[PDB]
C-alpha cells in the first residue's frame, strides 16, 4: 500500500528466513585458531618455507587483461627448459600444473627465468649425513640466512605497466594517414561487409565464365 512518493520496495522476506540466520560472533575466536595452526605447521616444517613456488599468469578477460597475478603451477615445458625432472619438482617446494600450455613466447621466457634463479638459491640437505652425494650441498654454505614466506620474497614485482614515459621532442611519431578516429571506423565497417563483398567478387568470376 503505497502512500507517498516512494521507491518501489522489493524485500525478499516472505519465506521462513528466521530459520536461517548466520551471525558472526566468532570472528576473533576463529582468527586465534588459524594463527595457532600456522605456527604449528611452521614448526613441523622446521627449515623449509611454508608456501610453494608459483608462476606468473595474466588474467583471461578483456577487462583485467592488463594485470598479472600468481598461477597454480609450472607447465611441463617450462620445467624441461630449466632442466628439472618432472618427479623431483613437487618434492622440493615447486608446484606443477600439467594442464596448462605455452601459446606465446613472452610467458614461456618470463617463467623460465623466474624458476632458474630459484634453483641457484636452493640449499639441499643430503638424505644421509655420513654419505653425501653429488647433488647435495657440500656442508660449507649450509649456514646462511634463510627466508620462510616465499610469497612476499617471490611475489609479482609489478602487476601493471609503468604509468607514463618521458621522451625527447622530435622523437614523437606520426599518426595514421587518415587519422586515429577514422582508422577505427574503417576497420569496423570492413568486418561488417566481409561477407557481402566476398560473394559479389566470387560470383563475378563465374558470371564472366
Amino acid at each position: 500500500a503505497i502512500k507517498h512518493n516512494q521507491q518501489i520496495p522489493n524485500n525478499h522476506f516472505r519465506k521462513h528466513w528466521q530459520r536461517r540466520v548466520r551471525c558472526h560472533f566468532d570472528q576473533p575466536g576463529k582468527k586465534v585458531t588459524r594463527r595457532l595452526a600456522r605456527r604449528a605447521k611452521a614448526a613441523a616444517l622446521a627449515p623449509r618455507p611454508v608456501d610453494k613456488l608459483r608462476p606468473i599468469v595474466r588474467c583471461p578477460t578483456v577487462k583485467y587483461n592488463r594485470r598479472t597475478r600468481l598461477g597454480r603451477g609450472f607447465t611441463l615445458e617450462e620445467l624441461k627448459a630449466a632442466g628439472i625432472p618432472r618427479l623431483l619438482a613437487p618434492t622440493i617446494g615447486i608446484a606443477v600444473d600439467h594442464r596448462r600450455k605455452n601459446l606465446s613466447e613472452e610467458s614461456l621466457a618470463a617463467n623460465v627465468q623466474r624458476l632458474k634463479d630459484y634453483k641457484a638459491r636452493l640449499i639441499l640437505f643430503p638424505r644421509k649425513s655420513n654419505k653425501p652425494k653429488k647433488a647435495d650441498t657440500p656442508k660449507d654454505q649450509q649456514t646462511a640466512e634463510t627466508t620462510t614466506s616465499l610469497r612476499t620474497s617471490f611475489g609479482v614485482e609489478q602487476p601493471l605497466a609503468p604509468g607514463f614515459t618521458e621522451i625527447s621532442k622530435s622523437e614523437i611519431p606520426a599518426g595514421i594517414e587518415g587519422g586515429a578516429y577514422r582508422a577505427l571506423r574503417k576497420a569496423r565497417s570492413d568486418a561488417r561487409l566481409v561477407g557481402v563483398r566476398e560473394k559479389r567478387a566470387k560470383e563475378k568470376a563465374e558470371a564472366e565464365a
Binding site: 519465506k15 528466513w17 536461517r20 540466520v21 548466520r22 551471525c23 558472526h24
Partner: protein
C-alpha cells in the same frame, strides 16, 4: 584377447545371432525367483570392465522389476488439494529402475557391499539386472589395497545414499553451466542462497 570381440559383438543387439540368444535366456529367467544367486556372470566382458574379479569374496546377484511408471497411491482418486497437483496416472519416479534393483538386493545380502550393476535383459513387463557384491570381512579382500578402501565404516549401504554410478546420474553430479543448481548438492546450495549473513561491523 577374446574380451575385445565380446565388446564389439554385444554392441549389435539387433543382429540375428544376438537376438536369438536374448530371447531364449529371457525365458530361462522369469521361471526362477525374483531374486536369486548367479553362479558366474553372464556378461564376462561387461562385469570385468566394472571391477569384477575372479577371486573369493566376489559374488553376483540378479533381480527383476516391474517396468512401468509410478502411480500415486491415494484412496480412490481423491487428493484433497488444488487442481495443479491432482493428477494420478502419468507421474514418474525420480530414480532409475536400475537403482531399485540394487536396493532390494542390498536388503537380501545385508553383510556385503554393492560395487556396480549392469543391464542384462528386458521384457514387456520386466527389466533384468546383475549386481556385483563384495565381502568386506573376507581375509582375501582386506589384504589387497586396490579394494580394501571399501571396508571402512563410511561406505555402509551406499546403495540408498546415492553413491553408485547410477546414483550419481540421478543427481546432477557433473561440471558445467548446465548442472548449476545441483553441482555440489541440490539441497546444500538452496541453503546457501537463502541464508542471511550478518557481520559484526555492518
Amino acid at each position: 584377447g577374446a574380451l575385445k570381440y565380446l565388446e564389439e559383438l554385444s554392441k549389435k543387439k539387433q543382429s540375428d545371432v544376438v537376438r536369438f540368444l536374448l530371447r531364449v535366456r529371457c525365458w530361462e529367467y522369469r521361471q526362477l525367483n525374483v531374486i536369486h544367486r548367479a553362479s558366474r556372470p553372464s556378461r564376462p566382458d561387461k562385469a570385468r570392465r566394472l571391477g569384477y574379479k575372479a577371486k573369493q569374496g566376489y559374488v553376483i546377484y540378479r533381480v527383476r522389476v516391474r517396468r512401468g511408471g509410478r502411480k500415486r497411491p491415494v484412496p480412490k482418486g481423491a487428493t484433497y488439494g488444488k487442481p495443479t497437483n491432482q493428477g494420478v496416472n502419468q507421474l514418474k519416479y525420480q530414480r532409475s529402475l536400475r537403482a531399485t534393483a540394487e536396493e532390494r538386493v542390498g536388503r537380501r545380502c545385508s553383510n556385503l557391499r554393492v560395487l556396480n550393476s549392469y543391464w542384462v535383459n528386458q521384457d514387456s513387463t520386466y527389466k533384468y539386472y546383475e549386481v556385483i557384491l563384495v565381502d568386506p570381512n573376507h581375509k582375501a579382500i582386506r589384504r589387497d589395497p586396490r579394494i580394501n578402501w571399501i571396508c571402512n565404516p563410511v561406505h555402509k549401504h551406499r546403495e540408498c545414499r546415492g553413491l553408485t554410478s547410477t546414483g550419481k546420474k540421478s543427481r546432477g553430479l557433473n561440471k558445467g553451466h548446465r548442472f548449476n543448481k545441483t553441482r555440489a548438492g541440490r539441497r546444500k546450495t538452496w541453503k546457501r542462497h537463502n541464508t542471511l549473513s550478518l557481520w559484526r561491523y555492518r
